[PDB]
Design a protein around this ligand. Structure first.
Ligand SMILES: Nc1cncn1[C@@H]1O[C@H](COP(=O)(O)O)[C@@H](O)[C@H]1O
Ligand SMILES: Nc1cncn1[C@@H]1O[C@H](COP(=O)(O)O)[C@@H](O)[C@H]1O
Ligand SMILES: Nc1cncn1[C@@H]1O[C@H](COP(=O)(O)O)[C@@H](O)[C@H]1O
Ligand SMILES: Nc1cncn1[C@@H]1O[C@H](COP(=O)(O)O)[C@@H](O)[C@H]1O
Lengths: 161, 159, 161, 159, 161, 159, 161, 159
């Protein structure tokens, strides 16, 4: 019942992307919370959120943001938990600013970064699931079934119009 | 004593970078194995490595390569374990090729990607440690010490 | 009758692009097969496909994929045949990730890479045809006619609205 | 005597770049402090620095960092003071990561961004001076001299 | 009543972007002027505008332009005032040419550069306000209220469709 | 004895890169010719080279150049033979210009493009060999040996 | 009456861009020809076109192409005349491939390169006019009038919606 | 004897690049002047230079600069003469900033742009020569010789 993953994002505009992480965690029956935390507009909210995450029982944080994306990195600055970062696609630079802002963390403070956009959001949830699966055999079985099914569902030839 | 993290790299020329992940795991006393596995030159070696990793008791795989860096993604394709990707700085394109080749995985098969180069190698080991810390209280305490020491050690002013 | 080129692609979404390779091979009367093989979702299918390609009588593989595109490279890892890679245009990064993921193969395992998108797909078929033409005089004549006609069909001035 | 500009930088390795901002402020006789504050390694040090800057009588903050450079943006998040950002040239991506990480702030929290590297460090100090000059006539005159000397000193032909 | 900020832009096409700077200065009750000055088409107009800005009572210049954007840099060449530059998004290169053309000023002639597009325009006004706030306590209070309200208005969770 | 692969390059400064294609063809005992042909400085030399290549009994052309690299594309324009393109690493843009100039051929005139630099030169020769192997069983066996040795030689762990 | 500028382009698809060069030359009363010449599909047509340009009385060549754009460079390889290159915007890479393919000519064979797209086409005509103006006083007066008018037609403030 | 080409550059640090344009003009016996004019540090020097260029009998201006390279565009803004732009290779971004800052001129004010670095400097001088050749038959013949010698001198095979 209690959340074991936190999904955080910098704004409502990030939800179109971050919803894919939420949906996948629900699919895999992983209890989680989904919040807006702005690194730029609510820095003390972020400090408190990240500092207290482990004691609140969270095991993984998925953080999504675009542009000069500081949310995942600053979350990782304050938590000892693994933080996974989703680069949200930006208007002009198509998430290249998002990506570099997230992935290029200095040695000492990791962010596990996924692909730009919805694929990255979905993969952040799957990566979070694979982490939790290491010490939750029920989840590990559900993940195995999920991966096996993905493999089995790939067609052999295209629908050629 | 038995490895719980596998560090794999596409070639000897990646060692200068991946040694930083090795050093960090050793500092934190995390049993690990350190291997050369090339997605493109040794594809069956990779298939067997990745397929058997969980049975062997590995919990996290750290995979580094440069150029068109297929090693992390293909590893993730064959294992259910978390795979962390280190883009090795390439000669021409300075790891931008490595970075895009690794991070841009389609939905369904994740690679947790870290920075280009030595920083990313170190951070992949730290990220692996933070994952292992979730169910190893002694290591969690050692990782807390490591992070606390990092923070406390930053000078207040430049020399 | 038996296929001498294999066209493979990572997903149905690649078909809009890869159809151009299929169409050109048909135009030149080159027997071929057209399949979906996912490097990420069906890695053992790919290993078996690429490992057995030469013994099944294939001479050239055209492989198309986008994003972090591993399909052409991993195909080449397992076959001694020439593998030609088509970078499928991606949403955010416009096929730049596709291109670099395909073309930047390490020394030892080649992928002959074509342009991003439909042009690359068509050129992969033409390149495949030029390879087969070296030891198939009927095809060589058809290719010569095809190239000659392309040259002859270029107008001398634009239709100026 | 009390500092009116704070120069902060993510680490010692930024000093080679940020020293140019320090030198310029000193040349123009602008009292300033020069500190290492890491957004990612010392986040609470940064929070306290940025939150208290105005109370302490700082007017402008110059912040430099490389890579995923969060220092200027996070500083701006906690202060009402103008924050100027210097992208430090990174090893792999030559400060393109630093530049995008700094300049691409969403509406609401500004960072005035300067060029990558030493040029940008110098220009952040000059920009801070032009801001201070608005309400300090003696400094305004010294800045006018500095700019006049820069212009007058350019040779007419190459050696 | 007399303007203390000048907003200048290279063309009418820049207004869609630069209007956001105008609107914010008005919101904060900062008297300003809003003009078209073309570095390429009206270089002597620019020289005169920038040279006389301080004596006309301006304290900050916000300059917006796209493509090979010379307006902010050339403005700074002629004024001792702080000049803030807004990179206007360009058609092909999405404001990357704008950004590099503005931000990469040589040591000696600063331009304080903001984000590509509308966000940068709004931030240029906010940065200008923060500068003026240093010696205008009424404005400083309005800015504090403005920032505080932005912080307070961030929701705690997304509207999940 | 008569060449079946032509290696052409835009200038002497490409040799440091293109020599790797030469070495590989020689290792595999593939008769070849190695020439300097500049699309831009010797356009008629190129026209004649490319137009006559098939008559002369060439089967594959490997063409390398840097910068705005027109050599492979223009070669392909005049021959029906497969043309493989090697982007030579340029000074400023590190072969990104070379790469785009070569790979981005419009539909109708193909260039099979390989990686930037020495890797790409080696791979163009390997790709040419894999093409020739389709109708030369002795060479096919030698290429199989080469690939087998590459795979088998990869160490299991770094030094 | 006889053309003094040649405008050449690789295909009909380039005309949407290259029409702007044609229109400007007509505006300035510069006699010119406008043709399709494909470097990739009609290389011998290009060789003959470029080799004979000076003897046919042409003074400047404007060449437009996109993607891996070889037309301007190969034109310059064969003519001693000044060749100006227009990078036509490409689909995926937005004319970055066009630009680098044109501008990055090796020392020894120049192409004077203009901006990506319609602006570059118009500027190539203006650059061509400025070249011809050096030895044609009537044209020089028309160009002076044209530049003066451009300067005079810039508004002083935006139409603020 | 009176200059018909002006070479201008943003600073002394551009000379290493712009000297190649100077050498070429001298080789072809084209009278020219070679000056430092900074758009940003000496804007009025530039205004006067560019405004008076035609009166002084200049026919072509070659302008080189690096970084946010405003010199060619602003020169073109004040003169009716053809302006050719040389992007000088910058430290961080390797002249990509220089290139975009120069080539991306909006319709109405052209800059004929050449390659980044020494190549571009040489080519700007060659382009200026090809322009002057249109109405100077002696120079046209010398340029024909230069181009003929370039073509004829390319070796047939690498050393
Ligand atoms: N992508 C790839 C596949 N197999 C090896 N590599 C990469 O090739 C680069 C150069 O390796 P080498 O020196 O062996 O050619 C290294 O970064 C290595 O990961
Ligand atoms: N982004 C960031 C956060 N904390 C430090 N950095 C940057 O990390 C780079 C390398 O620092 P170091 O040598 O300490 O690892 C410097 O540019 C420094 O600003
Ligand atoms: N693009 C091109 C056309 N002709 C030569 N080049 C390239 O120019 C580069 C530099 O050559 P050089 O030293 O002769 O100027 C080389 O990569 C060569 O292929
Ligand atoms: N963009 C610009 C304006 N004024 C000078 N520059 C450029 O600044 C670079 C570095 O010059 P310096 O060493 O004087 O700082 C040179 O490429 C010079 O053209």
């Amino acid at each position: 019942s209690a959340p074991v993953v936190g999904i955080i994002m910098g704004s409502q505009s990030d939800w179109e992307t971050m919803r894919h992480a939420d949906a996948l965690l629900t699919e895999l029956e992983i209890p989680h919370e989904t919040l807006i935390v702005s690194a730029d507009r609510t820095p003390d909210r972020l400090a408190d959120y990240a500092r207290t995450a482990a004691e609140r029982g969270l095991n993984v944080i998925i953080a999504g943001a675009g542009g000069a994306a500081h949310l995942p990195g600053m979350c990782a600055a304050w938590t000892r938990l693994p933080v996974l970062g989703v680069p949200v696609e930006s208007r002009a630079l198509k998430g290249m600013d998002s990506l570099l802002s997230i992935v290029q963390m200095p040695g000492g403070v990791p962010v596990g970064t996924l692909a730009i956009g919805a694929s990255g959001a979905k993969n952040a949830a799957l990566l979070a699931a694979s982490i939790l699966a290491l010490y939750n055999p029920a989840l590990a079985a559900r993940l195995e079934t999920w991966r096996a099914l993905q493999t089995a569902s790939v067609p052999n030839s295209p629908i050629t119009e």
